[PDB]
Paper text:
Here, we identify and characterize a unique GlcN kinase from the soil bacterium [name], closely related to Streptomyces spp., the classical antibiotic producers. In contrast, from 20 sugars and 4 aminoglycoside antibiotics tested, SjGlcNK only phosphorylated specifically GlcN and displayed vestigial activity with glucose using ATP as a phosphate donor. Determination of the Michaelis constants (Km) for glucose and GlcN suggested that SjGlcNK is better described as a GlcN kinase (EC 2.7.1.8) with a strong preference for using GlcN (Km = 8 ± 1 mM) over glucose (Km > 100 mM) as the substrate. In addition, the structural and biochemical characterization of SjGlcNK provides new insights into the role of these unique GlcN kinases as the missing link for the incorporation of environmental GlcN to the metabolism of GlcNAc in bacteria, an important intermediate in peptidoglycan biosynthesis, glycolysis, and secondary metabolite production.
SjGlcNK was crystallized in two different monoclinic (P21) crystal forms, A and B, which differ considerably in the dimensions of the respective unit cells. In consequence, there are two SjGlcNK molecules in the asymmetric unit (AU) of crystal form A, while four monomers are found in the larger AU of crystal form B. The individual structures of the N-terminal cap, the intermediate subdomain, and the C-lobe are highly conserved in the six protomers, across the two crystal forms. In contrast to the structural conservation of the individual subdomains, the relative positions of the N- and C-lobes are strikingly different in the six molecules. In result, the distance between equivalent atoms in the N- and C-lobe varies from 31.7 Å in the open to 20.6 Å in the closed conformation, and superposition of the C-lobe (residues 194 to 420) of the six different conformational states results in RMSD values ranging from 0.6 to 5.6 Å for the whole molecule. Principal-component (PC) analysis revealed that the six conformers of SjGlcNK are related by an opening-closure movement (PC1), i.e., a hinge-bending motion of the N- and C-lobes of ∼30° amplitude. In this movement, the linker connecting the two lobes (residues 187 to 191) acts as a hinge and the catalytic lysine, K133, which sits far from the active site in the open state I, approaches and establishes contacts with the catalytic D317 in the closed state VI, likely corresponding to the active conformation of the enzyme. In summary, ATP induces the closure of SjGlcNK, and the crystallographic structures reported represent six different conformational snapshots of the enzyme, arising from the molecular flexibility required to carry out its catalytic cycle. Curiously, the conformation of the side chain of D317 changes between the nucleotide-free (where it is coordinating the single and more tightly bound Mg1) and the quaternary complex structure (where it coordinates the two magnesium ions).
Author numbering:
A (entry chain C): 4 to 20, 27 to 65, 70 to 89, 95 to 117, 122 to 173, 177 to 433
B (entry chain B): 3 to 11, 14 to 19, 35 to 63, 70 to 113, 121 to 435
C (entry chain D): 3 to 23, 29 to 89, 96 to 117, 123 to 434
D (entry chain A): 4 to 20, 28 to 65, 72 to 89, 93 to 115, 121 to 436
The structure:
Amino acid sequence: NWSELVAAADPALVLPSVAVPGPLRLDALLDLGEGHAVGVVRSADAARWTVPLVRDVRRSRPGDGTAEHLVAALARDAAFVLEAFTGAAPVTGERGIIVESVIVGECAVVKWAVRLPAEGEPGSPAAQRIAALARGGFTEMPRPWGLLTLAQPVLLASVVAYLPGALDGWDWAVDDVRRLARGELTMDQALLPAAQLGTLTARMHAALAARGRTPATAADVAAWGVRMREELDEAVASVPGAEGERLKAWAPRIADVYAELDALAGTPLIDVHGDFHVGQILRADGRYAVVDFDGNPVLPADQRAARQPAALDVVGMTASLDHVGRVVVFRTPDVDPAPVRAWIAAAQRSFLDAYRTTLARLDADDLFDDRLLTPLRYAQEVREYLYAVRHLPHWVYVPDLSLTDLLP
Amino acid sequence: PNWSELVAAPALVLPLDALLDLGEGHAVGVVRSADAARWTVPLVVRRSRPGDGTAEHLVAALARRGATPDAAFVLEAFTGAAPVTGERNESVIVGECAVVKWAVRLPAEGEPGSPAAQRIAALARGGFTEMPRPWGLLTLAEGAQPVLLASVVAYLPGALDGWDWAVDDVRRLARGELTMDQALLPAAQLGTLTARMHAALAARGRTPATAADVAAWGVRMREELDEAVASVPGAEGERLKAWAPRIADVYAELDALAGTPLIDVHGDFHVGQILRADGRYAVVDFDGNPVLPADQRAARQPAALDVVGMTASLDHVGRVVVFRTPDVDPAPVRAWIAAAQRSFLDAYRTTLARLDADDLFDDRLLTPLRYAQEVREYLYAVRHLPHWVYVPDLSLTDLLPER
Amino acid sequence: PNWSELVAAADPALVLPSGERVPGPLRLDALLDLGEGHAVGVVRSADAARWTVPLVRDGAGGVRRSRPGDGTAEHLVAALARAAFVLEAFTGAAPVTGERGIIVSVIVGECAVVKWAVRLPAEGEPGSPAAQRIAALARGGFTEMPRPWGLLTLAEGAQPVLLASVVAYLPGALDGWDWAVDDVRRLARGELTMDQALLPAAQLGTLTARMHAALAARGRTPATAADVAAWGVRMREELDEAVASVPGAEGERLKAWAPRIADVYAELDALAGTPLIDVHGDFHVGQILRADGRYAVVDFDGNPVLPADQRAARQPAALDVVGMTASLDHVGRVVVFRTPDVDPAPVRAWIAAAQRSFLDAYRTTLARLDADDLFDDRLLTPLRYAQEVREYLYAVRHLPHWVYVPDLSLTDLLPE
Amino acid sequence: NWSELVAAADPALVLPSAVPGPLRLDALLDLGEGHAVGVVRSADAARWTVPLVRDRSRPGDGTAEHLVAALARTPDAAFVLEAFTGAAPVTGERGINESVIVGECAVVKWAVRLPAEGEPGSPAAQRIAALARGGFTEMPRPWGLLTLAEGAQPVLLASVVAYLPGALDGWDWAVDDVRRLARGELTMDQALLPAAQLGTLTARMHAALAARGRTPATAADVAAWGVRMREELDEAVASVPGAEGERLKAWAPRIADVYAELDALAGTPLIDVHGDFHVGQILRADGRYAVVDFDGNPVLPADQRAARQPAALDVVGMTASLDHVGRVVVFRTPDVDPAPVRAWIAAAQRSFLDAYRTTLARLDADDLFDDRLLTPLRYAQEVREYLYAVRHLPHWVYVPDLSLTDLLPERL
Ligand SMILES: [Cl-]
Ligand SMILES: [Cl-]
Ligand SMILES: [Cl-]
Ligand SMILES: [Cl-]
Ligand SMILES: [Mg+2]
Ligand SMILES: [Mg+2]
Ligand SMILES: [Mg+2]
């Protein structure tokens, strides 16, 4: 019996590869056939997991056939919701990919949502983001094959198209600016991706806004300033060296900009990407595809599904375009910084010109409130300080050089 | 029309005193310019391009055993020479098995050039096989000092240089994918490799360094130090300025090192010169030290010069892993830094003893030449990659207390 | 006072239309009497050059060249509507009357166009192959052209010398340099969707394949090693000529591109045996007329850059393909260059997608017609670079500012 | 009630194809049979001329016909319906501001966007009326003018003039004339005849427009000219790239020196002018010539397009226009011989000026032309070609560059 096997199983059954409080309890089970299933296992600490199960009971490994049986289920029960999309095929064969991700049929990617939110709490809105884009004709993304949710429905697994010959933005955008610096590309040729990124972002927001639109309240815009001023104080307190001395001096002028958010009540809030930057854009032979709709990892898990301004994605991409230029100057030996520095301003300009034009073409002008550009941009650069002191210490140069141009 | 009047009719040298006819219209000519500049132009009278068959005919001339020797050229073939077909300083892949490299820019008449032909030939005659398998060497006879014209070695497509596989090995060590012993095996095998390379190159003889030689070493190493002290900015420059008196005192040890053996060396030895091909390691690029002028890259150097070049690069691999990897655990990496250098030196010293060549390595040169290799990283940073100053800073922070 | 004596005593400018702004004396080699004092004359000048001269007697015992309105083109249409000359009539020929000149020729009956082959090849030399091209398309079912009415040739050797052609007149019809530019402009300002702006490019690929399949029915010739060798010599001479004459910044970039362009031309030596058929020769958008959704191809006189005695020779079918795909690129450059306040992003996206729509429809239609082997796609890259070099030569010789088209075209070709 | 139906209507009613409501009808001209012309004011005090019909008039509903039929013999004191000899009750409307071809021989042009209450608008009704008052015939035959009574400044609502179906504007026939000159199909004297005829047309036009009045330019007027022209010069120097920008940057000191001589031109006469004068505003119809488009300079503010200007402003606008016609022919025509074209450039301007000066002397009105303004106003005209180029057609910079290359050494 499923519930009799999971309860008597080792509490580490919910783990792909340290300590899980036991015993376990099976809340929901989706039988996939031939001894395969998708389990919603509840540990002793009231934590919920998504566990692909296979009988002899052990956790499914890449090659057992559970991700394969899930894709076959999409190509054809009350607690679960299987929503398939045009293009799902019953391909076979499994292969692990440490992006848990499993390549099925060498053309689809099954991703298990290992850690689930608590019973009732919101989780990842990736199922609602991908479904809204699909229903809205948004094609600049990996072709969705299916979504497995638990009745907002809790996301359990997703199947999208696999693009083996595609690179993320931290590869092709860096390569573009490098070829521009050494004369292999013209300035207009280097600005072309940024313009197409703006068109992509507006098409994404127009498709995502088809669900709804929530006016921001006074408590909403007030909570933004509280969190942003709280992150600024954490950055000032933790960023060391000469970068920290400049950040401490720039902190008063930044907080003054943050206070301008109180007057921006009533600004539209829609479903957004959340963690939008160049690295979330895959290029495949002139075509661009956006991935990763789980939300901003720095936000709490129960807030990664909340609606945000459309300008939040705009400042996230424009800042990454700025960061791409800083990386090219920082890493490339003998690089000419003049074309790269000139590309930083023009790429952000090309992006905004195309993002604003496409919104007007799609009758979605009021989605973008450009009064949020300056405050959210500074908040993005402050996050770069926090990411550096936590994961990559030398990365502090990126926001330091970016804020040097933003604060003349 | 003969080859002389045929070539005298200027872009022919860019992708006549001697002509090596390869048959069927293909040939190799040593063409001279109006500025007395000598060139190796593959002729066919257009300049040979990949697909014409000139480098393919050169390979056929190597695999052809018994041909009458030309009085001007010297074609020294090896066992790897095979008449492969198909084509793909200029380099041309021949038959996906050999790589032909035309020495486009030649030294002046009587001026020494690349010693690559002497290095490869000495290694092949000494039984050294940890390199791309040599096929042949084309040299121009010039009075007990051959001028390299073309090099033909084996082709290794899936081979990565050290700045890829060593950085990957250490990065896997920091994540637990490799044990410490596994990550230390390549360093120990490089030491065995370097000792075999020096023992084979020393078969051509050794020259005792004169008092003027070791004095010239200190002069050049102080000028690099003063240029580094005057260029490196910020807090790293302040530490280098405080370390400069202690570094310059170690440079004074060279005055009493007259008579140390100088042999044919690699010249530009670091981990990026070691390829990982077919589970084995291969050393490449025997052109000499790039920072030395063109006419000094063939000169003999201490064997410890290749040693410090590899041990320093092994240290720098660890610094790169800690610097570039987010969430990295620096403790296993820094433990590997000291252990890999020990594994290299311990294997290099024992292998030399097993070959009766322990007198090639003068470890008294180890500390002074290592400091000069780290200070030379400062000069690379301020001139090419400014943020690179962290590498010689973190390296000297570990070296100076120990030494 | 017969025709021969009148031509022998006439001023040598008799053989010229209105380009009188020719060494004598003249000599009449052929005379087709059309009746009532009208005739078509083959006049040889003192430099052995031959001409097609419409003649008319002026009543006073003299002769003069016919003008639009004298009735000589009128009598030719009547002759086609019923040995030495060959009056080959096609379905649709009618004895219409009334003449009207047009500068591109005489429009007869307000429904037919008569074109005189003013300049002829030397005696025994081959000239314009237009009579053989139209006849091959007509007997092959090719309907995407102005309706052929008649052809007047002179029997001489193996190829009859084309003297005059009569095709249907399409009033108001525009060539590609008008409707393709208009389509892309409408696309640039949102008046057409992307799929609507690509349909003409797809239909041109179907047209070209139907054209090549019909023309190849007269046979094919494998290119010899000497043929493909002459291609590289001619194409490299044109590159050296463009480098030496193209000025400005475009010339500076072309000098840095010449070593790479010449590297492409070295791929021709492995193309011996590729098929050569009767081709259009001067194929581009400007040769495609649009008349109420239908497309029609014109001007089969050959390529003007080649010598006159080589414009009838067989060429690779890919020559017409790279001619059209390059002009599709040139349409996009012209739209961006000439249109004020133009959005270049949809125009440049059209340049790439139109060439793919043309090639895909061309490959498929050739496959539907069992004519796959006519198209050697290995010629696409070398012939495309040669076509852009020809743009440089046209600019420095006829329209100096035109250098921007091959400059901006090669700026997008070389990086890829 | 017409006012009740417009008030409760969608605010987009004033658009022909974003307007704040509610709408308020200020005046309504009853045309009959359910047709009317309405002056609708939006909630932002933006006034509109809206053709109305019971159940916004579309081209084909008949409202443009009823306006033409009303001109064939005002029914309301608030409006002024000045008809002319030539208005015929033609039927059949065809759309082509909003212009509707009525009867295939008349053009009815609605003034969709009206000026604010009390602010000046298009002076087109004053221009056409003054030209007809003086007997000027070299224009499309006017049929009628519809204006709203508003003090001493009637607000233009609609204008009806004759439709010339086969007439081409200057940028067609002038370019064609110069091309035929380069091919030898026209003699030099034949290609210069239109330039003289335009000179006579411009002087006849100015003499009729100057009859309405003449204002001496104040010291602040000539001072504002130099400031505006110096800003346009600094703006072009800072934006024109390439070698053309390097020459303009080096020419700018010499050009700005000519802009300083305007301060002595205080008191120069200012009259009602065309405001946007070039060859493209001249229609050639069966051997005759007709001037069109009397709305004013489109780069000026809307409430400034009716202000009086020097008569020399229209002169330099046409002489520079003739210069650019030659540059276009050389630039676009393959195998063209530039020698007769460049000879025509200098000869056409001389032919235009000689006829202009002679006709003003014929009409005893040579005082309105101050030739001291020729050089500075011509420089400003060419400088604006740089601005139009960098803003709309980037390669157009060759036109003012080739023009200033001949003007600068000759004028100085
Ligand atoms: Cl970095
Ligand atoms: Cl680094
Ligand atoms: Cl053009
Ligand atoms: Cl133009
Ligand atoms: Mg990502
Ligand atoms: Mg044509
Ligand atoms: Mg106009």
